[PDB]
Design a binder for this molecule. Structure first.
Ligand SMILES: NC(=O)c1ccc[n+]([C@@H]2O[C@H](COP(=O)([O-])OP(=O)(O)OC[C@H]3O[C@@H](n4cnc5c(N)ncnc54)[C@H](OP(=O)(O)O)[C@@H]3O)[C@@H](O)[C@H]2O)c1
Ligand SMILES: C#CCNC(=O)c1ccc(F)cc1OCC(=O)O
Length: 316
């Protein structure tokens, strides 16, 4: 298992990164510092997570300390839905750069295919509670992303939560200048994504798996929901390999040629989660884990199910 995967922009991306959604601002600086100390070279960020300033403090301190060089880091962020407008994309990217203390991003993603009305609110609602859309389409937003590459602000651009028809729309864009490098999607044994993964990989687009542990800290969790970390079938595979259940859940996408971004703010778990380059799941193990699919989503974007670009009506 090599540590990096080659992207279609010619750059290499570390296959294991640190997630930062829900990482409290008072804990995430330490989390990222510890992560870099124990070997992480890829951090997954987003403006909407409201903690990029604090992530940036950690990155900058480790650069200043010469623990790592900037070229050895792979920093990812995402354009939020209220910034899909041509005239807002650069400023959104620049705000993220300023917060992260960087002069470029390694990868910048369209966070969701759905554009929302610009303004202070991340989810602008009408008087009845539906998200208020933007009229700006996926293709014009993509053109704005391409401009960021040409201005030196980002080294690669990609997409997140795009279904295969939406990926296809970009690939078929008239005058397409840069193909998406990455599609970041939810993926774990309860949402195995075989169809979408195959499609993206066949087009040379690298897939990043989010919520690989099933996001037990997701704010809308309910007691009756399935739980990957507590699934005795997965625990059994972990026990056989003398690893933790989380380590199995992280190794699983790695062996499918995916990038994976487990989140933790717990120093011991941050270190644990990185120790996944010392064992191999068998083909049988992999197929067994795949068999647990139930099309269950942590992130279903439920306030946007009527948006013209809602991604999850399509089968994949
Ligand atoms: N593009 C998108 O739309 C999108 C959507 C969702 C997520 N993401 C990205 O993907 C990252 C990962 O997804 P996620 O945050 O939803 O959830 P996740 O990585 O599947 O799970 C995070 C949870 O697992 C716990 N955990 C971590 N390591 C553990 C271990 N070794 N043993 C037991 N529990 C462990 C964490 O606890 P502690 O932190 O307390 O240790 C936290 O509660 C996000 O942080 C974000 O960067 C992107
Ligand atoms: C379900 C769903 C869609 N996402 C959200 O509602 C959301 C909102 C804010 C945030 F910080 C993370 C959020 O979810 C994770 C993400 O989108 O990266």
């Amino acid at each position: 298992m090599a540590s990096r995967i080659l992207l279609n922009n010619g750059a290499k991306m570390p296959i294991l990164g640190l997630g930062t959604w829900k990482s409290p601002p008072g804990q995430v600086t330490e989390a990222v510092k510890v992560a870099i100390d124990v070997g992480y070279r890829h951090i997954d960020c987003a403006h909407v997570y409201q903690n990029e300033n604090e992530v940036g403090v950690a990155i900058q301190e480790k650069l200043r300390e010469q623990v790592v060089k900037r070229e050895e880091l792979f920093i990812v962020s995402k354009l939020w839905c209220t910034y899909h407008e041509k005239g807002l994309v650069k400023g959104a990217c620049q705000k993220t750069l300023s917060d992260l203390k960087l002069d470029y991003l390694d990868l910048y993603l369209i966070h969701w295919p759905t554009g929302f009305k610009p303004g202070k609110e991340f989810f602008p609602l009408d008087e009845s509670g539906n998200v208020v859309p933007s009229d700006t389409n996926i293709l014009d937003t993509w053109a704005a992303m391409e401009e960021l590459v040409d201005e030196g602000l980002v080294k690669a651009i990609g997409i997140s939560n795009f279904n295969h028809l939406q990926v296809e729309m970009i690939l078929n864009k008239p005058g397409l200048k840069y193909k998406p490098a990455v599609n970041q999607i939810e993926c774990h044994p309860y949402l195995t994504q075989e169809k979408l993964i195959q499609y993206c990989q066949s087009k040379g687009i690298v897939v990043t798996a989010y919520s690989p542990l099933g996001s037990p800290d997701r704010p809308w969790a309910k007691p009756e929901d399935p739980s990957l970390l507590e699934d005795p079938r997965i625990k059994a595979i972990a026990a056989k390999h003398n690893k933790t259940t989380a380590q199995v859940l992280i190794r699983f996408p790695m062996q499918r040629n995916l990038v994976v971004i487990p989140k933790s703010v717990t120093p011991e778990r941050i270190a644990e989660n990185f120790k996944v380059f010392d064992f191999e799941l068998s083909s049988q193990d992999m197929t067994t884990l795949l068999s647990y699919n139930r099309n269950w989503r942590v992130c279903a974007l439920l306030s946007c199910t009527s948006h013209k670009d809602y991604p999850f009506h399509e089968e994949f």
